[PDB]
Amino acid sequence: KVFGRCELAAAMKRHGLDNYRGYSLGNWVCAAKFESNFNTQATNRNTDGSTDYGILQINSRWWCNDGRTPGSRNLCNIPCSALLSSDITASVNCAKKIVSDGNGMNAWVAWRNRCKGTDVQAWIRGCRL
Ligand SMILES: [Cl-]
Ligand SMILES: [Cl-]
Ligand SMILES: [Cl-]
Ligand SMILES: [Cl-]
Ligand SMILES: [Cl-]
Ligand SMILES: [Cl-]
Ligand SMILES: [Cl-]
Ligand SMILES: [Cl-]
Ligand code: NA
Ligand SMILES: [Ru+3]
C-alpha cells in the first residue's frame, strides 16, 4: 500500500506515535517519506547484507527475522515480511521499541539527515487529525 501523507499521519496517530518518546507526528511522517516514500512494500538491501523493510525501513540485523542475515537478532519478534503489510500495526509497534533503544530517532539515518531540525510540522499541514 502506498499511503497518502495525511492518511499515514492519521494511522500513525491512531497507533500512538504522535509524541511517542517526545517525537511529534511530523517527525514520524517525515521519516516515512524519506525511508519508504509512504510505501509499505519498500525493501532495500544494506551493505552489511541486512535488509530494511516497510514504511519505516526497519533493519533485519536487530529488529526482525528474514532468515538471511547472519548473526542478527529479531528484537521485535516478527518476520520481516510482517513489516510489509498494508496494516502498519507491526511496523509501529517495532518502531516504538527502536526509538526507545537510547538514540531516539537518530536510529533512522534518513531522519537524522533529512528531518531532524527541520520544520517537520509541514508534514501534517492540512490534515484532519
Ligand atoms: Cl508527500
Ligand atoms: Cl509535527
Ligand atoms: Cl530488497
Ligand atoms: Cl537471519
Ligand atoms: Cl520469522
Ligand atoms: Cl494501518
Ligand atoms: Cl537508518
Ligand atoms: Cl540520508
Ligand atoms: Na534478524
Ligand atoms: Ru490499523
Curated annotation (Swiss-Prot):
Residues binding substrate: 101
Catalytic activity annotation: Hydrolysis of (1->4)-beta-linkages between N-acetylmuramic acid and N-acetyl-D-glucosamine residues in a peptidoglycan and between N-acetyl-D-glucosamine residues in chitodextrins
Cysteines joined through disulfide linkages: 6-127, 30-115, 64-80, 76-94
Tissues expressing this chain: In the egg white and polymorphonuclear leukocytes.
GO biological process, one term: defense response to Gram-positive bacterium
SMART domains: LYZ1
Principal location: secreted
UniProt keyword list: Allergen, Antimicrobial, Bacteriolytic enzyme, Disulfide bond, Glycosidase, Hydrolase, Secreted, Signal
Functional summary from the UniProt entry: Lysozymes have primarily a bacteriolytic function; those in tissues and body fluids are associated with the monocyte-macrophage system and enhance the activity of immunoagents. Has bacteriolytic activity against M.luteus.
Family: Belongs to the glycosyl hydrolase 22 family.
Annotated protein name in UniProt: Lysozyme C
